[PDB]
Design a protein around this ligand. Structure first.
Ligand SMILES: CCCCCCCCCCCCCCCCCCCC(=O)O[C@H](COC(=O)CCCCCCCCCCCCCC)COP(=O)(O)OCCN
Ligand SMILES: CCCCCCCCCCCCCCCCCCCC(=O)O[C@H](COC(=O)CCCCCCCCCCCCCC)COP(=O)(O)OCCN
Ligand SMILES: CCCCCCCCCCCCCCCCCCCC(=O)O[C@H](COC(=O)CCCCCCCCCCCCCC)COP(=O)(O)OCCN
Ligand SMILES: CCCCCCCCCCCCCCCCCCCC(=O)O[C@H](COC(=O)CCCCCCCCCCCCCC)COP(=O)(O)OCCN
Ligand SMILES: CCCCCCCCCCCCCCCCCCCC(=O)O[C@H](COC(=O)CCCCCCCCCCCCCC)COP(=O)(O)OCCN
Ligand SMILES: CCCCCCCCCCCCCCCCCCCC(=O)O[C@H](COC(=O)CCCCCCCCCCCCCC)COP(=O)(O)OCCN
Ligand SMILES: CCCCCCCCCCCCCCCCCCCC(=O)O[C@H](COC(=O)CCCCCCCCCCCCCC)COP(=O)(O)OCCN
Ligand SMILES: [K+]
Ligand SMILES: [K+]
Lengths: 139, 138, 158, 107, 88, 489, 104, 158
């Protein structure tokens, strides 16, 4: 069901006119669901028992309060007073100043490319850390 | 338990995945795509080769270690920034650049594409490190 | 069978170099001339004059498209039928096919045939098991169909 | 249309919060995933959802969808994937060496 | 028109979802998920015809290659343990 | 030239990348990381002199103007924090040379070190909220891996806990950026500060400011958001822990500081009384935890919590004397908490135990370490010839000048209780007769601790040298008009 | 949209996919469902993609080769997917709905 | 060895078709991409990754040119010499070469070698007679030269 949530968020990205988000979302959700299925089938066979989600009333009240709180803050923020945006510059100068017709990629590598370097760094740290956790077993 | 059908359809399916990933990578500035999705699907082609074969056979077929790939792609992005720094400009200014290796004399390209190429190599390397690290754990 | 095609391509290159014009029209003219020349020199080659494998792989493409349409019409009349009528089967068939490429194109053709589905090609390349959807309807007629299919696959590879 | 996206990201937030407050670790990581989906859809929604062309200057439309929130979302997606893959391999390691899934029992 | 084809594909995806919910063995659920992904690729093609944009065809070929890789991965999983073998 | 501002960011980054190629060659790992950290210290000192001589340094990353690209801004406070980070990193690196075993540093240890200092140095100098987000995840990802590296059961468990908390807080910072983008429409600090001051009479800005308090207080442990930190910092090894206690919680404090001195200035009464009560709760939680434990690591952990509470209470007053006092206390507290974790590590190396009740009589065998810990304890408390006096003196003076008698008395009694905790360590551990330990010659690792102690003593003596930097920092914090006319040219 | 062939291709692919779905529901065994799903949704999705290909080729004068490579890929890959799931089901000692004369 | 070259050409065609531009520059780009892809898929083929036969036939072309120049320098110093010095010979050599193409390229190479001329390749494809111009000068050294030549001919065809 988390997989179905991921693929349908990708279908929202298609439907809200975001092609790059849809491509990356589909591939990343397929890889992540494969990692969840990795994590499932190595559960220990003792004390497993495959039991349902236990109902506690305080957890349900806290969860409904969290969801309705962020819903009402999103509604209050989206529907108030505002200054418009700064994306007329990016649709006016993606081709006249940079060399591109795509605008998500030109933002990612040219206008704001200084933070793409460090998400590359985050992925590098993540892969090196996974290698280090699996290989080092000093105990 | 011979996987003759799986191996032969892998052999005829892997080139169109590789062409699709390279076409996603080269057409990034003008159409959707980029280093991210192209690197992820190059890794997907190598994943398909991993599913059809062993773990030693695929590193025999593709003789790369991927930790050097993520390091060298990080170097490409940082070096693009440094080459921007030396010529009286701020870091990652991204003007044009001629490459005559000699290959296709004086190929004039925008230097955001080598930044994308660093993105590409690190994505391929990270995905392959994760998958073949989990695979040979036992 | 690919050496003759490569040889025709490089003879078209030699024809384009023999003049001083480089264009696709000169490439087609040189390819036609090289086709005639390789028709003269069929004795030295070993396999076949190379147009016959081209026409029979066009034949296999048309067989793929036609058996796809016939298979989906058969599934259409099975599903909308009252679904108590079918009779399943799993059966073996002997095989003379040696290389794994012709074995997988036989399997991919016979999967997409109306009423059949492959499971368990044997470890030896000598028999192929297959799941028939309708047992008394298509078990000997479709065996003649797959004998004609593997006959055409044999005459691709000479 | 933004109201409907608000009332569905609220349900993603409530579900994520309810799964994070559970007793097993894999439910907690599933709640992490749902919280990430809710945050990314919230970035897209609060950027605006008024109809225009996809952000591509080849299509010569009069008005375009906002390009900034999509780039911010794609940054957040690749960062969230890195942390999620790390945390899943970490949960695998803790299953292998400790030998239990019960989060309250972890002492 | 195109809306009729979307309704027909949506009801088809609901049917494959009914087969992925029930169905005793795992293989029925796998084939239902494969067909559900291919139907999603069809929905993306028709909504790209509706939006009058050529900006989503890469999504279609991506859904095809992802569905094939996922199905061969889990079909390798049901057969004798591992999805990735160890070196000799 | 003008790229000097990136030299705290670029120099460790490059270093981390070239440390990936040779894992098994530990000698060259040590040599390259040591030389690059020394170059980092020299470059940060040059940046601090640069921002002292002429004005605040702004650099657009591309050649793009100020709203539309990423802008990096170094004022005097960020340069001071970068230099303090550099000194702490050098001392922790030499302690890492002597302390971390062979097996843990064949597996990419110094790379993760350099990525952590990349994350913190990038976080102190940025001019965008979402770039600050990305630097938070660089920092946090490297801290996850440095916490888990080695793979014993304890650091597995508390890496699960720490990772869970920071994932939740990362998603909350995403939704805060989303709300503020829907209100304002921009993403750099100066231009959305101008836009917030153009519509400052709206309640949604107060709600989003409270949400940033919750996010940054999950980052640096405030009450009631502190609960992850005792077990998480009880897990890691000693130089990793010194890095964590010196650097990680103090960038949340700086982010709160920049947020409420730059962005949210209208309707200040509600936000400042909220900060005052959260800070008082933080101080009380910290001193209760410091009194409660007979365990050295827990004592230093709750002293981190108490000092963060004192700094937040200094932030909660919009007077330049309180801002000056919390800047002084911030710098010395970073240095001092790194020093105290290195002391705790040396004592654990000697005793093979962490229980105060188990050992006594260390002055008779380790006199230099004993009197160094004595001076470190008295400098932590705030005794006037030592480091942390002028900070809490200016905080107490600015609270008395704004008529807060009870809160100033809480600050002074907190100073008393933190002195009691560290002197409990000194009096039960070092004094007494010899029963707990066996004679073992320490070596090498004592000297970075002595270097930090000498710098803290010289910091306490030389306030007149280190003050005009802090004066320019205060002049840019209590007036953001200079900040927004430096960037938006 | 104005073409008879494009409209009938789109609707025929849609109806044939729905036929694949009702064959997935109604058929009693994993292998009969493999038959129905494999062949019918393969031809349905290729008819839909041919219709979309022809529509963008006609009313925009844009030749999109990605759709043609998608058609060739789906044709190559969905029956071998059905083959792999059916062999995986057969080797799991799974058999349903009154097995006839069948050999191992 | 020609199937891989044809496969690289048709993959370059697929690359030119995947975009909408038709030009030789895109053909070279697609040919380089296909060269990398065929380097990935070397396991399925049987003979060799195809660059090594290309480099060794370039090696045979250079050997042809060099042995031509050396042969004409040797004939130059034989003819202008006082012509009572040469010693003729006709001798046999065993042969392991099977197909007639490698036999005739061996014969055309060893004709053009300094001091040798072919007559009477045997009816069996097993021995080759040859006329040496200088008997004591080149009868065992040039036999080592022709052993290296037929070694290179053996490693052309794997
Ligand atoms: C549909 C979407 C999901 C597709 C994949 C689902 C099947 C595989 C999931 C994992 C199966 C269970 C599992 O953990 O099996 C272990 C192997 O897993 C592993 O080796 C884990 C890695 C599996 C990688 C599969 C990649 C799938 C495609 C990813 C997206 C496309 C490519 C993008 C780059 C065998 O367990 P054990 O006892 O042997 O112990 C491990 C040492 N042998
Ligand atoms: C430059 C001037 C033109 C050079 C090319 C002239 C035509 C050469 C090919 C004609 C020919 O006899 O082809 C085969 C000989 O191949 C060969 O002699 C090998 C290929 C020669 C290519 C020359 C250009 C490079 C016959 O085939 P075969 O029967 O001998 O071979 C067994 C394969 N089934
Ligand atoms: C910056 C300082 C770089 C030079 C000093 C460090 C390297 C010292 C020599 C180590 C060495 O030779 O490493 C080789 C690669 O070196 C390298 O790759 C080191 C140079 C890194 C250059 C980075 C830019 C490209 C591989 O070492 P090995 O084959 O002996 O390993 C066998 C067991 N690991
Ligand atoms: C003109 C203006 C000057 C301004 C100066 C401003 C800066 C002041 C900073 C003061 C820093 C002092 C640091 C502590 C001293 C370290 C001593 C190390 C050697 C040591 O332990 O010597 C003991 C004797 O000294 C001792 O016993 C002496 C140390 C104990 C008293 C410390 C008093 C600190 C007062 C508060 C700070 C002021 C040995 O003792 P043993 O019997 O074990 O011999 C065992 C035989 N090797
Ligand atoms: C900043 C803090 C600096 C504190 C003062 C310096 C501390 C060390 C003083 C010398 C003691 C003996 C050093 C012996 C030595 O070669 O140590 C190396 C470390 O380098 C060192 O210890 C030298 C580090 C120099 C750092 C400051 C450079 C500024 C320019 C390797 O360590 P090892 O092999 O001896 O120990 C591993 C045992 N497991
Ligand atoms: C085996 C060996 C064992 C050794 C054990 C030693 C243990 C501790 C013993 C006591 C150490 C005493 C150290 C005394 C240092 C004296 C002050 C340094 C000189 C100096 O330039 O000081 C100020 C600036 O320092 C600064 O600003 C530097 C500190 C700031 C560093 C930044 C990070 C914090 C300027 O003062 P001034 O002359 O302007 O003012 C005075 C009136 N005007
Ligand atoms: C249109 C979309 C692209 C179609 C072409 C994709 C690449 C197909 C070739 C890749 C491949 O695996 O090549 C051989 C398979 O050949 C084959 O499967 C037969 C040739 C396929 C040609 C397809 C175009 C017509 C491997 O060779 P092998 O080892 O299987 O064959 C023994 C020969 N030494
Ligand atoms: K997120
Ligand atoms: K998402």
């Amino acid at each position: 069901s988390l997989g179905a949530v991921g693929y349908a968020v990708a279908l929202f990205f298609v439907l809200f006119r975001a092609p790059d988000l849809a491509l990356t979302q589909l591939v990343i959700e397929t890889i992540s669901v494969a990692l969840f299925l990795l994590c499932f089938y190595h559960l220990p066979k003792f004390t497993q028992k495959q039991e349902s989600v236990r109902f506690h009333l305080g957890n349900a009240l806290v969860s409904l309060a969290v969801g309705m709180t962020m819903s009402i803050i999103a509604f209050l923020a989206y529907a108030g007073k505002h200054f418009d945006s700064i994306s007329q510059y990016y649709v006016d100068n993606t081709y006249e100043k940079a060399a591109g017709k795509n605008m998500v990629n030109v933002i990612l590598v040219d206008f704001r490319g200084f933070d793409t370097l460090f998400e590359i760094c985050v992925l590098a740290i993540a892969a090196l850390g996974i290698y280090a956790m699996v290989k080092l077993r000093l105990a | 338990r011979n996987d003759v059908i799986l191996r032969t359809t892998t052999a005829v399916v892997t080139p169109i995945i590789v062409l699709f990933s390279v076409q996603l990578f080269f057409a990034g500035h003008y159409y959707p795509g980029g280093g991210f999705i192209g690197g992820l699907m190059t890794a997907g082609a190598i994943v398909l080769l991993l599913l059809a074969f062993d773990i030693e056979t695929v590193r025999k077929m593709v003789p790369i270690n991927y930790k050097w790939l993520v390091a060298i792609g990080l170097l490409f992005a940082v070096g693009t920034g440094m080459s921007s720094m030396f010529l009286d400009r701020p870091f990652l200014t991204h003007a044009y650049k001629y490459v005559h290796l000699p290959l296709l004399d004086h190929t004039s390209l925008h230097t955001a594409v080598l930044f994308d190429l660093g993105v590409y190599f690190v994505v391929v390397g990270v995905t392959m490190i994760i998958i073949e690290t989990i695979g040979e754990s036992d | 069978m690919a050496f003759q095609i490569l040889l025709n391509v490089i003879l078209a290159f030699v024809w384009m170099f023999l003049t001083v014009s480089f264009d696709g029209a000169s490439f087609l003219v040189g390819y036609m001339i090289g086709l005639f020349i390789l028709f003269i020199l069929r004795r030295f080659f070993h396999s076949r004059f190379y147009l016959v494998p081209v026409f029979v792989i066009i034949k296999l493409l048309f067989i793929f498209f036609k058996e796809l349409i016939l298979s989906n019409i058969a599934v259409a009349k099975v599903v909308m039928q009252r679904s108590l009528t079918i009779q399943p089967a799993i059966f073996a068939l002997p095989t003379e096919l040696k290389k794994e490429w012709e074995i997988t194109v036989l399997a991919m053709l016979i999967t997409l045939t109306p009423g059949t589905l492959v499971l368990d090609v044997s470890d030896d390349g000598s028999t192929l098991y297959i799941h028939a959807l309708n047992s008394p309807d298509v078990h000997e007629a479709i065996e003649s169909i797959k004998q004609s299919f593997e006959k055409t696959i044999m005459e691709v590879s000479k | 249309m933004e109201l409907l996206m608000i009332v569905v990201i609220g349900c993603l937030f409530a579900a994520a919060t309810y799964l994070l407050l559970s007793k097993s670790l894999l439910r907690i990581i599933i709640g992490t995933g749902l919280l990430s989906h809710g945050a990314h859809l919230l970035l897209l929604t609060m950027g605006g959802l008024k109809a225009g062309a996809p952000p591509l200057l080849g299509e010569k439309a009069s008005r375009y969808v906002d390009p900034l929130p999509q780039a911010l979302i794609l940054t957040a997606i690749v960062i969230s994937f890195g942390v999620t893959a790390f945390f899943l391999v970490l949960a695998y390691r803790s299953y292998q060496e400790i030998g239990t899934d019960h989060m309250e029992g972890m002492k | 028109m195109l809306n009729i084809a979307l309704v027909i594909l949506s009801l088809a995806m609901v049917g494959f979802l009914y087969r992925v919910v029930k169905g005793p063995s795992t293989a029925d659920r796998i084939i239902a998920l494969d067909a559900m992904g291919i139907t999603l690729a069809g929905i993306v093609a028709i909504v790209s015809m509706l939006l009058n944009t050529s900006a989503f065809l890469d999504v279609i070929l991506l859904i095809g290659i992802l569905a094939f890789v996922g199905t061969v991965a889990f079909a390798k999983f049901l057969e004798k343990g591992v999805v990735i073998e160890r070196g000799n | 030239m003008s790229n000097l501002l990136l030299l705290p960011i670029v120099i460790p980054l490059v270093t981390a990348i070239v440390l990936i190629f040779f894992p098994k060659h530990v000698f060259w790992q040590r040599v390259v990381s040591l030389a690059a950290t020394v170059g980092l210290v020299v470059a940060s000192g040059a940046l601090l002199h640069r921002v002292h001589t002429d004005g605040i340094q702004t650099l657009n990353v591309g050649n793009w103007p100020a709203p539309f690209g990423i802008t990096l801004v170094s004022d005097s406070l960020s340069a001071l924090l970068v230099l303090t980070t550099s000194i702490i990193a050098l001392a922790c690196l030499v302690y890492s040379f002597y302390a971390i075993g062979h097996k843990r540093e064949t597996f990419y240890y110094y790379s993760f070190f350099q990525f952590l200092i990349v994350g913190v140095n990038g976080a102190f100098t940025t001019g965008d909220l979402f770039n600050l987000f990305v630097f938070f995840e660089v920092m946090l990802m490297s801290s996850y891996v440095l916490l888990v590296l080695g793979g014993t059961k304890i650091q597995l468990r508390e890496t699960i806990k720490y990772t869970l908390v920071n994932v939740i807080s990362s998603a909350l910072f995403v939704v805060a950026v989303a709300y503020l983008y829907a209100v304002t429409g921009t993403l750099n600090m100066a231009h959305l500060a101008d836009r917030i001051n153009a519509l400052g009479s709206s309640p949604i800005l107060t709600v989003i400011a409270v949400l940033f308090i919750i996010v940054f207080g999950l980052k640096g442990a405030i009450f009631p958001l502190y609960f992850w930190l005792p077990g998480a910092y009880y897990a890691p090894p000693t130089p990793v822990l010194a890095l964590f206690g010196g650097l990680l919680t103090k960038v949340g404090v700086y982010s709160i500081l920049r947020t409420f001195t730059l962005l949210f200035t209208h309707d200040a009464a509600y936000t400042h009384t909220l900060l005052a009560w959260l800070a008082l709760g933080t101080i009380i939680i910290g001193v209760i935890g410091a009194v409660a434990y007979n365990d050295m690591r827990y004592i230093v952990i709750y002293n981190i919590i108490a000092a963060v509470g004192v700094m937040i209470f200094g932030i909660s007053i919009m007077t330049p004397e309180s801002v000056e006092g919390t800047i002084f206390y911030l710098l010395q507290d970073m240095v001092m908490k790194a020093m105290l974790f290195l002391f705790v590590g040396i004592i654990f190396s000697i005793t093979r135990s962490n229980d105060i009740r188990s050992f006594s009589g260390l002055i008779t065998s380790y006199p230099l370490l004993g009197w160094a810990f004595f001076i470190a304890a008295l400098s932590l408390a705030g005794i006037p010839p030592l480091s942390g006096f002028i900070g809490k003196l200016l905080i107490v003076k600015a609270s008395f000048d704004a008529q807060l008698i009870f809160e100033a008395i809480v600050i002074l009694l907190s100073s008393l209780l933190v002195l009691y905790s560290v002197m409990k360590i000194f009096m039960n551990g070092f004094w007494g007769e010899k029963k707990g330990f066996e004679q073992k010659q320490v070596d090498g690792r004592l000297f970075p601790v002595l270097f930090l102690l000498v710098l803290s003593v010289a910091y306490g003596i030389g306030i007149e040298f280190v003050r005009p930097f802090v004066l320019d920092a205060v002049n840019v914090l209590v007036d953001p008009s200079m900040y927004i006319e430096a960037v938006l040219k | 949209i104005a073409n008879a062939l494009v409209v009938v291709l789109i609707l025929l692919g849609a109806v044939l996919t729905l036929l694949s779905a009702v064959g997935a529901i109604r058929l009693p065994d994993v292998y009969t469902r493999s038959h129905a799903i494999s062949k019918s949704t393969t031809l349905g999705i290729m008819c839909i993609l041919l219709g979309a290909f022809l529509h963008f080729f006609i009313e925009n004068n844009h030749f999109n080769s990605r759709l043609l490579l998608g058609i060739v890929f789906i044709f190559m890959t969905s029956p071998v997917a059905a083959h792999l799931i059916s062999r995986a089901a057969y080797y799991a000692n799974v058999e349903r709905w009154e097995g006839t004369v069948r050999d191992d």
